Each structure stands twice: as structure tokens, then as C-alpha cells.
Design a protein around this ligand. Sequence first.
Ligand SMILES: *[C@@H]1O[C@H](CO)[C@@H](O[C@@H]2O[C@H](CO)[C@@H](O[C@@H]3O[C@H](CO[C@H]4O[C@H](CO[C@H]5O[C@H](CO)[C@@H](O)[C@H](O)[C@@H]5O)[C@@H](O)[C@H](O[C@H]5O[C@H](CO)[C@@H](O)[C@H](O)[C@@H]5O[C@H]5O[C@H](CO)[C@@H](O)[C@H](O)[C@@H]5O)[C@@H]4O)[C@@H](O)[C@H](O)[C@@H]3O)[C@H](O)[C@H]2NC(C)=O)[C@H](O)[C@H]1NC(C)=O
Ligand SMILES: C[C@H](CCC(=O)NCCS(=O)(=O)O)[C@H]1CC[C@H]2[C@@H]3[C@@H](O)C[C@@H]4C[C@H](O)CC[C@]4(C)[C@H]3CC[C@]12C
Ligand SMILES: CCCCCCCC/C=C\CCCCCCCC(=O)OC[C@@H](O)COP(=O)(O)O
Ligand SMILES: [Ca+2]
Ligand code: NA
Ligand code: NA
Ligand SMILES: [Zn+2]
Length: 781
Amino acid sequence: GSCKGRCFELQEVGPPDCRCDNLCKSYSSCCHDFDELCLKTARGWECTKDRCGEVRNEENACHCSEDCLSRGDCCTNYQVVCKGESHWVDDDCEEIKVPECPAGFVRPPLIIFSVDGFRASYMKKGSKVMPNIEKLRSCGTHAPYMRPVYPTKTFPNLYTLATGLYPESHGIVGNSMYDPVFDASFHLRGREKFNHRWWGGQPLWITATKQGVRAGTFFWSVSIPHERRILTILQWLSLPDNERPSVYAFYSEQPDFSGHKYGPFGPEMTNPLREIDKTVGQLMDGLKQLRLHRCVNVIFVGDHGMEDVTCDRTEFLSNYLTNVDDITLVPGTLGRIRAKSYDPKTIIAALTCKKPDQHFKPYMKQHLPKRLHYANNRRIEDIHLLVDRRWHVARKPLDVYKKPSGKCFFQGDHGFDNKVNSMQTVFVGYGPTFKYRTKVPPFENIELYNVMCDLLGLKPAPNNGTHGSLNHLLRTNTFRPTMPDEVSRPNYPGIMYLQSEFDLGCTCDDSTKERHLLYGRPAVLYRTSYDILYHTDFESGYSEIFLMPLWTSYTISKQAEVSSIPEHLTNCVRPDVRVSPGFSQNCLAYKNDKQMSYGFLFPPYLSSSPEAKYDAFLVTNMVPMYPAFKRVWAYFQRVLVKKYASERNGVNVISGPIFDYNYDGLRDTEDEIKQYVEGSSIPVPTHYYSIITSCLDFTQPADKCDGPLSVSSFILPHRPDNDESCASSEDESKWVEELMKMHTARVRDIEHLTGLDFYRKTSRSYSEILTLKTYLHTYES
Ligand SMILES: *[C@@H]1O[C@H](CO)[C@@H](O[C@@H]2O[C@H](CO)[C@@H](O[C@@H]3O[C@H](CO[C@H]4O[C@H](CO[C@H]5O[C@H](CO)[C@@H](O)[C@H](O)[C@@H]5O)[C@@H](O)[C@H](O[C@H]5O[C@H](CO)[C@@H](O)[C@H](O)[C@@H]5O[C@H]5O[C@H](CO)[C@@H](O)[C@H](O)[C@@H]5O)[C@@H]4O)[C@@H](O)[C@H](O)[C@@H]3O)[C@H](O)[C@H]2NC(C)=O)[C@H](O)[C@H]1NC(C)=O
Ligand SMILES: C[C@H](CCC(=O)NCCS(=O)(=O)O)[C@H]1CC[C@H]2[C@@H]3[C@@H](O)C[C@@H]4C[C@H](O)CC[C@]4(C)[C@H]3CC[C@]12C
Ligand SMILES: CCCCCCCC/C=C\CCCCCCCC(=O)OC[C@@H](O)COP(=O)(O)O
Ligand SMILES: [Ca+2]
Ligand code: NA
Ligand code: NA
Ligand SMILES: [Zn+2]
């Protein structure tokens, strides 16, 4: 077969017949004359003055002849150089109220322009280096930065962009990975990645195709130059209505390639950024030449940032482990350890707080911060190393490959914790469906799959985005989110039992809703039996199944006083006459459990009076806590809640337990709970959460807030030691806050882990609430 009349055909031809599509090279399937007909390069990609009105020469890469517009193969700058038109970038910003598309366009097309390793801060270089990108950013909708997923590498992040899924769910958990069920390894180099079996979820091109929206072919063989890809996208946009795709992808390997070689701050980065802008220029000039520049939505998006890293800053496992030849390490800016073909507890202990300024921390994957969502996949090794920004971890010094000079290859790298500043990347949306000259807050790249589906009129496949949380990016929204319906309604028990009926082994020395549930009652979204319990200082939703609160809500004013637990109440636990003895915890179980103590969800320390303080010792306010965790919890309750109330002008706090023994980020059922307090059916939480809300305008108190809300949340691991915190032998003021900042979380994360729905009664729109629920308080900003 021949490629004559078929260059970059959108249909693909099955074997044995030869192909002419943009991927044929990658499958060794092109017709003999593909290069000759489809990959013309003569005279480059730009018209010059001397070429204007030339006699057409079919050898040229693109054309500057009078007939080129009608034939559809002009160079992108043809009208500029030969017809006196202006570059798109030199035109004034003008609002696109409505898509201005040629007749027969059913919807505005979407072009996704992805850049690899584009740090958010590169945008500070401005129009002097990147005038086209700067115009898109200024005129369109932009965020200061976009948060990638962990690990902050290309393959996980690009496939998250495509699917809306965390890597643990889509399956591309690294650039490199081993599947023990396949007994095979996936790598950047080689053929294994072309096997469909690695790739889960439903990416945008499949979602589009299944719902009758033409995607064409996203992927390009890497040897086709950038300029040819741009020209081909433009030619596809000129196809007839029954063939023209509605969505296009362009991907650039820059500025990642340069970032690795020169570091993110090297003066050598300027040129690669200029070249990316030149390519954006060609696209926009090219669209303008087709009169599609006010028709198409363009997304300019990065996969991750780039950090300064050097050979000099490498930790070696051979300095900790006596037995490194028995382990396989996925090295670099993260660590994944498994057996060569070895004991996990030994390895973790040998890597835990062994050197004073140790530049990595080992975790069993279930103990990683829940915000990373990096555990529920067989391709994720049990042992994980979180590596400090600017550092590498390697197995042994002679595992590190060198350049001929002896020095390491990289001055830049990425892959670190996705809350690290240097890993943040970019988002700009420009076009008829995006807002005009609008800044939006930072958001996570898991949210974009939904947006792209909305931009194409597609129903998204189930994903980890919160659909509606990015409605404020768009001028017009084809998705209106609705609050989920409550599944279980509470009971409201009154006094039902006499104290004499209780023998729990306990002893003690003898406008609630309005004040303490500021944003309404959380809805329970699964089938269960629970009670609303009111008190002077706090309200709770008490589970009869788990024998403790699902949530506890209370408000602490700026002027609230902290008091001590009187010595005589130290061991006070009181039966709750509203709740059956059989639905209550018992003190005997804690006495007999050598490892387990207990804490309180509402802190006795913040009670409004000595009289009300007795409510805080109710058995229905008690939760199981390891003595090590009580050090953390007690400092949070006695010191930090009041600090936050002073800083934020009051806070509302909702605290509760989380059960996630199978580490899937979702509420466990009873069956899935694997640990109970000794001799009892009191389940042991894997984590404790808190959601701390106040007024965004801190000049207004939390309980009289007219406007937007401000939230910070955490999901603290409920651990029997503080081995995670290397300073834990010191006073809690030296390490507890650091622990908590590491385990910051979104409200949405807590919702997945609890089956609760928060903020059900506010004066805010539901899409603004959805935005609030996806917010992550990072303590870099
Ligand atoms: C983030 O969002 C995710 C998506 O909503 C949430 O994951 C989902 O979690 C639910 C609840 O536990 C799971 O429900 C069980 O599914 C079982 C059915 O098995 C399979 O069917 C799924 C549907 O497949 C059809 O539809 C999709 C459209 O999206 C198409 O892509 C398919 O072609 C097909 O038409 C399928 O999605 C699922 O896929 C996984 O498994 C394969 C291997 O077989 C992997 O290649 C792939 O990467 C997925 O793996 C992930 O999930 C599995 C659990 O299924 C994990 O073991 C694995 O470690 C990895 O995390 C599968 O083949 C059914 O028998 C049960 O009764 C449940 O109904 C969904 O399967 C699951 N979906 C996905 C994509 O993972 C996730 O909870 C959420 N996370 C948070 C924190 O909120
Ligand atoms: C990552 C890769 C592009 C970069 C590159 O390395 N180019 C190859 C040059 S070389 O190695 O031959 O020298 C793309 C190209 C085709 C894609 C594949 C597609 O064809 C077919 C599949 C489509 C599925 O929905 C996703 C998985 C799937 C297997 C794609 C995964 C990603 C694939 C492999
Ligand atoms: C809407 C989605 C956005 C557009 C593209 C989505 C495609 C997602 C699908 C699969 C992931 C890989 C797609 C191929 C792109 C190029 C892959 C590649 O070879 O990247 C260079 C890589 O060595 C750099 O790795 P890093 O060291 O992690 O930067
Ligand atoms: Ca679970
Ligand atoms: Na005990
Ligand atoms: Na410690
Ligand atoms: Zn890279």
C-alpha cells in the first residue's frame, strides 16, 4: 500500500495492510513512502518574505503560495508574513462571549497542550520569555499553580490528567513498576508499556469515543517534529463535519529534559521556554489563520514541577542496612523497597531515625499520609521511602550511573511529595467556555478529567474528581451538582436508662445545634444506627454499631478559656442514660488491655463551666487511644485548638474516628475492622480526623460569618508509637504540629473515609462548598 492521499489518516488499518497514521512509526507499521509523503521538512516551518507568492513546490514542509489557504497547507505564519496580518500575540485581549465557529461545528473543539516539568514559578518570567503563554494566562482563566498527584512523575500524572483517577486506581503508580501477578516490569524505555493490561480506568479519548464524540488519535510517534504535529492538528480541524475530531492533544517533553540537565533555575532554561512559546505561537497563529482562534478551547497544563537535585545529596541504604544485596530499590526522589526474590519490620526499624538530619523517612504504605492516596495497588511495594525535597535515595554508591566525567547526570529532578512547592505545575484555560481574565485558586489535577468532559458534553466515567468543584473556571456549566441524600436518619434518645442499670466498670466523683453545628448536621450516607446527643458544649452523632461517635462538633470562641482536668476527675468516666449499656464502651476493657488507653473527642479542657465539664467525661464521648497517640491528641486539644481559635477568630471543630484497615481510602464495614480493644467489640480506629472551620474574613467570628469559609483538616494516623516523629522524646511543642501538617487532608478525603457529608446548611452555593471540600491546607503556602 501507499500513503498518497492518506497522510495522518484518522482511521487505522488492521494488519497486514500498511498504515499512514501518526502512531504507525511506534508500531513499525507505516507504508514504505510514509516519510517521503507525510514528513516533508524542506525549508522549515516559517514563511519568509522571499517565499510569498512562490510557485508551489510539493517538496516543502509547508507552503507560502497564493493557493495554500485553499489547499489547507500554509505555514502557520503565512498571513502574517505575506498578507500583513498580525501575530495572535500582538492583538488586544478581547472577550469571547460566545464560540465563533464556522458553520457545521457542533461544539467548540478542545486542544490540550501538555508541558512536561513546567514549574508553576516559570510563569513569573512573563511575556519577555513566553509572550504567547502569557497572553493565554492573562486573557483566560488561570490558577497560580496546579497540584500534581504523587508520585510527581510524568506517567502517573499524565494518566491521572486523562482519567481523573489517583495512580493507585488507574494502575500507573510510577514511571517504573513491577506487577507480581504479571511477574513483569513496566518502564519508560521498551515495549512493555504498549501492553493494554497496565492501564486502568477510562481515559478521555475512550469516554469521548464511547459517547460518539470524535477523538481521532491523541498519541504521536516521538520522531515526528513538534511543528508537524501542530500543522496536522490544524489540518484535522479543517476536515468535514463528519470526520473532524472534537478533541486534540499535544505533548511537549520540554522543559523537563532541560530541567534535569540544568536545574530549574539555570540560565540555560530560558531557551527551552522560548521554544515552547514559539510552538504555542504557531498553534494560535495557525488557529487565527483558520478563523478558529475564538472557537477552540485551549488548555495549557503541566504534569509536575522540578527541584534542584545533585549527586552530592544522595542517601545510601548501604549506610543503614547490613544486607542491601537482599533488596530491590526503586530509587531517586522516592523509594520503593521489595525483596530481591529479608524481613519488613527489620528493614523499617533499620531505616527509622538513625542519623541526626536523615533525608528520608520510611513508611509501610498503609502509614503514608492519607492525602497521597498511595497504597491500594499491588504494584505499590509495602515499604516506601518519602524523600526530602532536593535529595535522592540510592541502594549503594556503586548503583549510581555516572557520566564519563564521573559526575551524576541530573541537576534537576522531581517525584517528591505533591505538596512540595517545587513540584507544583501550571494550568491555563483559554477560549469561549472558560472565563475571561479570571484567576482561580489552586486545585488538583485529578479534577480536570471532569472539566474536559464538561467542555465536550460528555458524561464522566466514575473518578476521583469532585464534579462541580471547578464550576467557577467556566463561563457556562453543563453540570449542576446536587447534594447527596442522607441514607440513615438519626434517633434522638432521651433519658432511657437508670444509672443502676450500667455496670461498665467505670467510676467518677459526682441552641446547642445553633452554637455547635454551624453548617448543619453531617449526613450519614450508608445504612447504620446512630443517635444525636446534645450537650452544653458539644453535639455528637453516636454510632450504636461502633460504640463511639462518628462525629463530634463544637465551637470555640476567640475568648474561650482553657482549664485543667481536676485531679479528682482524672479517671472519671460517666454512663450516658440516653444510650444502652450494651451500646456503650466499658472501662474494664481498657483496664485489661495493656496496650490501649482512651481519650475524649470533645476536650474536657475546653468546657464552658465546671458543671458542663462533667458532660465531657460521658462514656459516649470516649474513644480508644494508644498512650503514644494521646501525647499527640492531648497537645492538639489542650494547646492547638485554642491557638487556632485565637488566630482565626473562633473555630468550629468536628472530630471523629476513621477505620481503614484495607487502606483503600474508603470507610470500612464492620467485617473489614481487624482490631478491637482486648476482650471487647470496641473497634480500634486506624486514624482520627478533625475539620476546623472559620470565617475566611477573620475579622468576623466563626459563628457570625457572612461570607466564604476557611477550612483546615487532618487525618492523624492512630499509631502505638511515635516512630514517625524523630523528635518525639522532646516536649510536644517541638514535634506534634509538624506531624499534623504532614497529615493535612481535604474534607473530601474524610468524607470518603467516613461516609459522612459535611456543610449541608450554609449560605454558600453548593459548587463553592464543593470547592471548599477539595481545599488542602499546605503549610508551604
Ligand atoms: C477513586 O475513584 C475510583 C473510581 O470510581 C474508585 O475506584 C472504584 O472503587 C469501587 C468501590 O470499591 C470499585 O468497585 C468494585 O468494582 C468491581 C468490578 O471490577 C472491575 O470493574 C470496574 C468497572 O469496569 C467497567 O467500567 C469502567 C468505566 O470506568 C471501564 O474502564 C471498564 O472497561 C469496564 O467497562 C473497573 O473499573 C475495575 O478496574 C480495576 O481493576 C483492574 C484490574 O482488573 C485495574 O486494571 C484497574 O486499574 C482498576 O484497579 C483498581 O481498583 C481495584 C478494585 O476494583 C483495585 O483492586 C486495584 O488495586 C486498583 O485500585 C475492575 O476491573 C466489583 O466486583 C466490586 O463489587 C465493586 O463494585 C471500582 O472497581 C473501582 N474503580 C476503579 C477504576 O478503580 C476509588 O474507590 C476512588 N478512591 C477514593 C479514595 O475515593
Ligand atoms: C507512551 C507512548 C508515547 C511515547 C512513546 O514512548 N512513543 C513510542 C516511541 S517508541 O518507544 O516506539 O520508540 C504511547 C504511544 C501509544 C500509547 C498506547 C496506545 O497506542 C494504545 C493503548 C491505548 C489505551 O487507551 C491506553 C494504553 C495504550 C497501550 C497506550 C499507552 C501509551 C502509549 C504507549
Ligand atoms: C487529556 C490528557 C492529556 C494529554 C496526554 C494524555 C496521555 C496520557 C497517557 C499516557 C501517559 C504517557 C503519554 C505519552 C507522553 C510522553 C511520555 C514520555 O515519554 O514522557 C517523557 C518521560 O520520559 C519523562 O518522564 P519524567 O522523568 O517523569 O519527566
Ligand atoms: Ca477501607
Ligand atoms: Na489500658
Ligand atoms: Na519518635
Ligand atoms: Zn523528568
